[PDB]
Amino acid sequence: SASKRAIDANQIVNRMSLDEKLGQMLMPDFRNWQKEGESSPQALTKMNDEVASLVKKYQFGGIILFAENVKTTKQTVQLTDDYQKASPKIPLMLSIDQEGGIVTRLGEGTNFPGNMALGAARSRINAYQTGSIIGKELSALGINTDFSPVVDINNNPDNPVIGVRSFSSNRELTSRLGLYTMKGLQRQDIASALKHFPGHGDTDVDSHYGLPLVSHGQERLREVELYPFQKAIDAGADMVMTAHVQFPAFDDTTYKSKLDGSDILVPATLSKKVMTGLLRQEMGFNGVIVTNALNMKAIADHFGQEEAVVMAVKAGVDIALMPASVTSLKEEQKFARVIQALKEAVKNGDIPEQQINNSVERIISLKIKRGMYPARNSDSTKEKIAKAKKIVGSKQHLKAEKKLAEKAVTVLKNEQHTLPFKPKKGSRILIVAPYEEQTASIEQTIHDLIKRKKIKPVSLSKMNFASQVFKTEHEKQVKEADYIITGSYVVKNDPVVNDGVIDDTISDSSKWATVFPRAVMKAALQHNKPFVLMSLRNPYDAANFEEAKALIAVYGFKGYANGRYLQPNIPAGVMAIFGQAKPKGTLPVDIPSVTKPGNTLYPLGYGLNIKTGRPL
Ligand SMILES: CC(=O)N[C@@H]1[C@@H](O[C@H](C)C(=O)O)[C@H](O[C@@H]2O[C@H](CO)[C@@H](O)[C@H](O)[C@H]2NC(C)=O)[C@@H](CO)O[C@@H]1O
Numbered sequence: 264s265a266s267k268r269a270i271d272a273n274q275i276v277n278r279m280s281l282d283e284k285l286g287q288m289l290m291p292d293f294r295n296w297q298k299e300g301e302s303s304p305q306a307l308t309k310m311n312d313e314v315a316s317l318v319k320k321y322q323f324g325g326i327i328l329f330a331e332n333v334k335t336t337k338q339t340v341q342l343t344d345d346y347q348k349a350s351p352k353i354p355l356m357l358s359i360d361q362e363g364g365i366v367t368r369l370g371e372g373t374n375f376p377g378n379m380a381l382g383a384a385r386s387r388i389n390a391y392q393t394g395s396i397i398g399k400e401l402s403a404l405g406i407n408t409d410f411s412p413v414v415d416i417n418n419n420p421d422n423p424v425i426g427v428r429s430f431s432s433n434r435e436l437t438s439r440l441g442l443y444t445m446k447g448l449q450r451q452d453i454a455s456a457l458k459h460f461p462g463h464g465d466t467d468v469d470s471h472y473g474l475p476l477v478s479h480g481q482e483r484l485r486e487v488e489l490y491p492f493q494k495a496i497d498a499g500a501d502m503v504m505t506a507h508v509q510f511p512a513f514d515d516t517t518y519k520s521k522l523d524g525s526d527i528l529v530p531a532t533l534s535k536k537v538m539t540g541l542l543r544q545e546m547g548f549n550g551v552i553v554t555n556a557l558n559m560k561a562i563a564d565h566f567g568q569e570e571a572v573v574m575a576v577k578a579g580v581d582i583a584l585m586p587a588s589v590t591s592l593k594e595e596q597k598f599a600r601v602i603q604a605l606k607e608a609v610k611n612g613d614i615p616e617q618q619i620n621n622s623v624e625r626i627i628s629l630k631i632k633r634g635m636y637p638a639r640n641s642d643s644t645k646e647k648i649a650k651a652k653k654i655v656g657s658k659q660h661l662k663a664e665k666k667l668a669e670k671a672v673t674v675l676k677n678e679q680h681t682l683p684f685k686p687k688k689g690s691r692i693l694i695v696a697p698y699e700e701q702t703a704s705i706e707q708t709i710h711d712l713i714k715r716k717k718i719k720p721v722s723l724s725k726m727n728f729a730s731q732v733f734k735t736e737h738e739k740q741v742k743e744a745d746y747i748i749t750g751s752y753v754v755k756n757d758p759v760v761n762d763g764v765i766d767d768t769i770s771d772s773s774k775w776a777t778v779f780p781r782a783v784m785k786a787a788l789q790h791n792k793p794f795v796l797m798s799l800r801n802p803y804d805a806a807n808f809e810e811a812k813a814l815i816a817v818y819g820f821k822g823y824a825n826g827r828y829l830q831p832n833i834p835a836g837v838m839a840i841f842g843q844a845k846p847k848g849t850l851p852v853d854i855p856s857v858t859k860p861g862n863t864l865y866p867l868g869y870g871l872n873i874k875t876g877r878p879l
Contacts, residue, residue, distance in 0.1 A: 286322035310345035325356030343405030382851025394447020438491035459506035462488025668835035673848030683842030700822030733782035756803035
């Protein structure tokens with residue numbers, strides 16, 4: 264099969280002109296479009312003849328879709344069908360960032376609790392079924408490529424840039440879950456891309472040249488960052504997406520910035536040493552290498568979008584993502600100029616022509632392997648739409664989402680059997696969180712439990728604390744409550760701490776993200792109120808609540824708006840609090856102590872049984 268796949272791809276590439284070949288290596292977006300006569304772009308939700316004409320002219324290898332383009336199942340199937348009608352010779356790779364959790368694009372699909380939640384749920388089977396469900400939805404929609412999984416390792420709490428998009432701080436847990444997410448997508452014939460190579464998880468905090476910098480030496484990079492990429496590559500990864508990050512330990516090449524004329528270190532995307540020497544040769548990856556988005560401001564500014572395409576191709580990449588930003592026919596020639604720059608590089612010998620042929624063969628082999636080519640589907644658009652409506656966001660998928668999110672909830676403290684809350688009729692629950700959307704999600708979850716007669720009728724009060732200070736009016740609310748649920752949101756956990764003592768005296772609204780919830784905790788404890796803290800994003804804030812009797816993490820923070828839950832994590836937490844779910848989560852990261860700096864407060868793998876109060 265793979266043998267036959269390669270001969271086939273070779274015959275196809277041998278017949279293509281250079282224009283057709285360079286076309287395959289481009290993957291633009293058409294997020295917004297401004298038609299002739301229009302004064303401004305608007306979201307592209309349906310095909311028009313202007314966009315179709317550029318797809319026909321330049322013969323792109325693919326299109327990346329964004330949320331603007333995929334708002335409903337009906338519109339999306341119509342759009343992917345019309346994109347493919349405009350690309351009949353070689354079907355397009357139609358791609359998307361459908362990661363789950365905090366990065367999703369589908370307007371009507373299943374969101375999932377995200378990677379760190381999968382880390383917390385631990386099982387490779389859960390990651391596989393998640394990738395499998397995402398893959399089923401994408402496939403029904405006519406989307407055939409997913410830029411997932413993230414296999415970046417979030418191992419530095421002091422710079423958690425990938426954060427909940429990462430499975431874990433541990434290389435093996437990240438590797439395992441990445442591998443099975445990828446197998447799950449591929450099982451549904453979705454091309455999967457590992458990202459972001461060679462590892463975006465731990466960049467230098469004081470990066471100050473616009474491109475993130477990783478200062479670690481090769482031994483550490485080979486032992487940690489590269490490890491889940493290697494495992495997945497050997498298990499048959501289709502694609503790898505680059506990181507626009509400097510790695511001096513592998514390439515110290517500089518270029519003269521077009522932004523300020525200074526010498527700038529090359530990012531991994533434009534490094535032959537990383538793309539060819541390390542990924543292609545040393546790690547033996549022969550699948551498709553795709554750049555991270557070339558419109559990222561620092562690439563465009565330091566290198567120029569057009570010249571970056573040429574440099575990335577020279578470095579050994581196969582697909583340039585978003586190689587030019589074209590939003591109307593007035594700027595179509597941006598595409599012609601990109602092609603022309605690649606032609607000049609081939610003509611003058613900067614890029615050997617055989618390198619181009621080899622890259623397009625990788626692309627065509629992948630399209631064949633994942634059943635993108637040849638296309639022999641005889642269903643009408645209407646028929647595909649009806650099929651997709653049964654699959655996308657189906658209640659079966661939503662049930663899986665719910666059970667995964669509930670499974671991932673991690674109980675860090677439950678002293679004195681504080682949880683579950685079992686309120687008597689007439690209890691007042693005070694619900695406190697940074698935003699109205701978050702308090703609404705908690706409120707709506709409790710309301711549903713009441714209508715479902717799972718808990719007795721209770722009164723609810725909400726307290727939204729972003730930018731606020733806890734004062735006498737808030738303490739009054741705490742005193743009047745019978746149960747308190749508080750949500751905490753941090754990226755980096757940054758309380759003011761002195762010699763291991765957290766500062767509670769900050770009374771002017773500054774530092775609210777840590778000061779306010781702690782103040783609610785202190786009042787509740789002072790007034791003997793059942794109090795639970797729910798960590799909403801990065802779980803490092805658990806370290807701020809050692810005095811609390813009940814503490815959980817849900818690893819996702821988006822709330823409820825326009826009758827819709829934006830993420831399932833918060834409802835999963837509330838369900839656990841009221842004894843209607845079985846949390847089984849264990850930490851996928853270490854949580855550093857703030858009161859004893861340098862010590863781990865809660866280690867990787869820690870999590871309690873909510874019933875027995877004992878560790879899992
Ligand atoms: C709001 C927005 O779109 N910002 C983008 C970046 O995307 C963010 C990070 C996002 O939506 O997740 C964009 O980042 C890259 O975009 C690629 C394609 O959408 C992603 O596949 C990729 O994962 C993402 N890179 C990272 C490290 O997250 C960025 C270019 O890097 O340009 C805008 O800022």
